[PDB]
Amino acid sequence: PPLVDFLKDILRRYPEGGQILKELIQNAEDAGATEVKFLYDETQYGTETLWSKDMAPYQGPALYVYNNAVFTPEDWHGIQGIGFNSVYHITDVPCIFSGDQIGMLDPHQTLFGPHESGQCWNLKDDSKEISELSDQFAPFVGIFGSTKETFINGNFPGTFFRFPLRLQPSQLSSNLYNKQKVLELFESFRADADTVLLFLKSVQDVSLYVREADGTEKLVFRVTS
């Protein structure tokens, strides 16, 4: 059972595209986060200074998810009920930024090498490479308080994910996400939000946003317990 086929089957067996939203809230809860933010970002990034040209399909609109906890080493090991794997409903290349590290997962095992299932950069140890790959890392600044100085100094005291939305079929999935389909996820969560927060004791605030192409931000929904 190869990784891509395994995941493909899991996504067929657990078809609800929205599970990653409740799943990430649960993970934030376990981590002792007190707030979670979801943001649909329409921003298109450049495709020049990437790890490789094969990264270009992942430079467009993305769902971001923030929480105010920092990953432990164990959290990173865990990341690298179908758990995190529901993310693959919406993206082929989930990205994780927490503390001093950014990771990108690649179940296709094509982007980083035929023996690699992903890649990690340390903001300090790999600072030169990051700076070289400015288009690759631009999507990790200017959101949730991450600034250029975050990368210069090398620590972001929180967690966020970037899930570039699937715009063409892949070996994982035929399901494409656009703004409409992401807003459908947001509306479905909105319906269930009081029930989700019901049993949580750490996460007390969940908010959903859109950042438009011109940079304008719209509050879609916010729920507190």
Side-chain angles (χ1 to χ4, degrees):
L3 182 53
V4 63
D5 308 81
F6 173 84
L7 282 170
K8 208 178 189 149
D9 175 71
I10 276 291
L11 296 172
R12 291 219 59 207
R13 283 199 270 133
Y14 296 67
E16 214 274 284
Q19 229 294 97
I20 195 60
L21 304 181
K22 290 178 188 184
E23 170 75 13
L24 290 178
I25 290 168
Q26 280 295 330
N27 294 347
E29 174 77 4
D30 286 350
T34 60
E35 67 156 359
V36 180
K37 296 185 163 178
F38 293 86
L39 183 147
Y40 174 69
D41 180 22
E42 307 212 67
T43 307
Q44 171 73 55
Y45 287 93
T47 58
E48 293 200 348
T49 43
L50 308 176
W51 169 267
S52 76
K53 345 187 285 88
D54 285 334
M55 306 302 293
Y58 310 108
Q59 290 297 101
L63 178 65
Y64 283 86
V65 183
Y66 164 88
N67 73 248
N68 63 336
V70 174
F71 264 28
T72 64
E74 199 49 52
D75 295 332
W76 280 108
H77 291 163
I79 215 121
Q80 272 213 289
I82 55 159
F84 194 67
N85 292 311
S86 62
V87 78
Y88 297 109
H89 277 305
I90 68 169
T91 187
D92 300 304
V93 184
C95 305
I96 308 100
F97 181 15
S98 186
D100 67 347
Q101 183 167 289
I102 293 170
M104 294 190 181
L105 306 180
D106 171 40
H108 281 84
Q109 299 183 83
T110 56
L111 301 174
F112 302 114
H115 290 213
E116 312 292 316
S117 291
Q119 189 93 218
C120 280
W121 293 263
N122 184 277
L123 269 64
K124 294 158 262 245
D125 303 340
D126 302 310
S127 64
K128 173 56 184 66
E129 181 174 335
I130 286 161
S131 75
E132 203 153 0
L133 299 181
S134 49
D135 286 335
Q136 193 73 251
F137 293 96
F140 301 91
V141 293
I143 193 164
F144 308 126
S146 179
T147 67
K148 69 173 275 141
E149 296 87 357
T150 301
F151 282 80
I152 292 178
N153 296 109
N155 198 62
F156 182 71
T159 300
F160 66 90
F161 299 87
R162 173 184 157 80
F163 305 138
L165 292 149
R166 183 177 299 104
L167 308 179
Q168 59 185 196
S170 78
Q171 293 175 31
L172 288 172
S173 179
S174 296
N175 292 323
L176 308 187
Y177 278 80
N178 59 13
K179 178 178 195 174
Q180 257 191 233
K181 276 182 72 171
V182 177
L183 293 173
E184 281 174 11
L185 300 185
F186 283 5
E187 183 67 6
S188 184
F189 174 76
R190 175 208 274 279
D192 289 358
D194 290 333
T195 302
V196 181
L197 272 64
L198 202 50
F199 299 97
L200 304 186
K201 59 189 285 294
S202 190
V203 171
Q204 291 177 322
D205 190 333
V206 181
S207 49
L208 305 38
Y209 297 89
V210 171
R211 178 184 292 179
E212 294 162 356
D214 69 4
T216 309
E217 290 182 358
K218 302 273 110 145
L219 176 64
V220 179
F221 174 66
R222 184 170 199 159
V223 59
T224 53
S225 69

Coordinates of all heavy atoms in Angstrom, one line a residue, residues 28 36 49 81 106 121 137 153 176 204 219:
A28 N -5.3 22.5 18.2 CA -5.1 23.7 19.0 C -5.4 23.5 20.5 O -4.7 23.9 21.3 CB -5.8 24.9 18.3
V36 N -8.1 30.3 17.7 CA -7.8 29.8 16.3 C -8.4 30.7 15.3 O -9.5 31.3 15.5 CB -8.5 28.4 16.1 CG1 -8.2 27.8 14.7 CG2 -8.0 27.4 17.2
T49 N 11.3 32.5 -7.6 CA 12.4 32.1 -6.6 C 11.8 31.0 -5.7 O 11.6 31.2 -4.5 CB 12.9 33.3 -5.8 OG1 11.8 34.1 -5.4 CG2 13.9 34.1 -6.7
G81 N -11.7 8.6 12.3 CA -10.9 9.8 12.5 C -9.5 9.6 11.9 O -8.7 8.8 12.3
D106 N 4.7 16.4 1.4 CA 4.5 16.0 0.0 C 4.2 14.5 -0.1 O 5.2 13.7 -0.4 CB 5.6 16.5 -0.9 CG 5.6 15.9 -2.3 OD1 4.4 15.8 -2.9 OD2 6.6 15.5 -2.9
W121 N 12.7 23.6 6.9 CA 13.7 24.6 7.0 C 13.7 25.1 8.4 O 12.6 25.3 9.0 CB 13.4 25.8 6.0 CG 13.5 25.4 4.6 CD1 14.6 25.6 3.7 CD2 12.5 24.8 3.8 NE1 14.3 25.1 2.5 CE2 13.0 24.7 2.5 CE3 11.2 24.4 4.0 CZ2 12.3 24.1 1.4 CZ3 10.4 23.9 3.0 CH2 11.0 23.7 1.7
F137 N 8.9 31.8 0.4 CA 8.7 32.1 1.8 C 7.9 33.4 2.1 O 7.4 33.6 3.2 CB 10.0 32.0 2.6 CG 10.6 30.7 2.6 CD1 11.5 30.2 1.7 CD2 10.0 29.7 3.5 CE1 12.0 28.9 1.8 CE2 10.5 28.4 3.6 CZ 11.4 28.0 2.7
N153 N 15.4 37.1 12.6 CA 15.7 36.7 14.0 C 15.5 35.3 14.3 O 16.2 34.6 15.1 CB 15.1 37.6 15.0 CG 15.5 39.1 14.9 OD1 14.8 40.0 14.4 ND2 16.8 39.3 15.2
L176 N -11.3 20.2 -6.4 CA -10.7 21.5 -6.5 C -11.4 22.4 -5.6 O -12.6 22.3 -5.4 CB -10.8 22.0 -8.0 CG -10.3 21.0 -9.0 CD1 -10.3 21.6 -10.4 CD2 -8.9 20.4 -8.7
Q204 N -11.2 29.2 23.1 CA -12.4 30.0 23.5 C -12.8 31.0 22.4 O -13.8 31.7 22.6 CB -12.2 30.7 24.8 CG -12.1 29.8 26.0 CD -11.9 30.5 27.3 OE1 -11.1 31.5 27.4 NE2 -12.5 30.1 28.4
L219 N -14.2 40.1 7.9 CA -14.6 39.1 8.9 C -15.8 38.3 8.4 O -16.9 38.9 8.1 CB -14.9 39.8 10.2 CG -15.4 38.9 11.3 CD1 -14.4 37.9 11.8 CD2 -15.9 39.8 12.5

